[PDB]
Amino acid sequence: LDIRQGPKEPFRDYVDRFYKTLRAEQASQEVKNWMTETLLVQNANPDCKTILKALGPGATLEEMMTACQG
Amino acid sequence: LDIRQGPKEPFRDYVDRFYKTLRAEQASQEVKNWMTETLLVQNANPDCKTILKALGPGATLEEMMTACQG
């Protein structure tokens, strides 16, 4: 996963690039979930990454987008 | 994935801790592959992470272990 959130890139934009790479692999829902729990959080910028980790297990993409909106 | 390779931790040891966490989720082969391509590489220490990235797509766990043995 080459996609990483720029320090000034809105989270939703990063999410869209991330999902574009994910779609290329025709990932299942299970894989999509694993990727959202791991790489999406791990590849987020400093500001966002901290917040996203604070959400805890099972946080949804929706909850992550809300947490880092702007 | 809380597991991260210590800067002085042998790669195989890190692999074992990594796989212990993975087994807890009863991941399929597909998921195991995705995790090996992403998190295993992304959570490797500075020295190892560089080398592992140089291997390119499709590198197997075996090839990664060989690359960072010690």
From Swiss-Prot, chains A, B:
Post-translational modification note: Phosphorylated possibly by host MAPK1; this phosphorylation is necessary for Pin1-mediated virion uncoating.
Signal peptide: none
Region (Dimerization/Multimerization of capsid protein p24): 1-70
Coiled coil: none
Cellular localisation: Virion
Function of the molecule: Forms the conical core that encapsulates the genomic RNA-nucleocapsid complex in the virion. Most core are conical, with only 7% tubular. The core is constituted by capsid protein hexamer subunits. The core is disassembled soon after virion entry. Host restriction factors such as TRIM5-alpha or TRIMCyp bind retroviral capsids and cause premature capsid disassembly, leading to blocks in reverse transcription. Capsid restriction by TRIM5 is one of the factors which restricts HIV-1 to the human species. Host PIN1 apparently facilitates the virion uncoating.
Subunit structure: Homodimer; the homodimer further multimerizes as homohexamers or homopentamers. Interacts with human PPIA/CYPA; This interaction stabilizes the capsid. Interacts with human NUP153. Interacts with host PDZD8; this interaction stabilizes the capsid. Interacts with monkey TRIM5; this interaction destabilizes the capsid.
Name the record gives this protein: Capsid protein p24
The species this protein was found in: Human immunodeficiency virus type 1 group M subtype B (isolate NY5)
Gene transcribed to yield this protein: gag-pol
Covered range of the whole protein: 283 to 352 of 1435
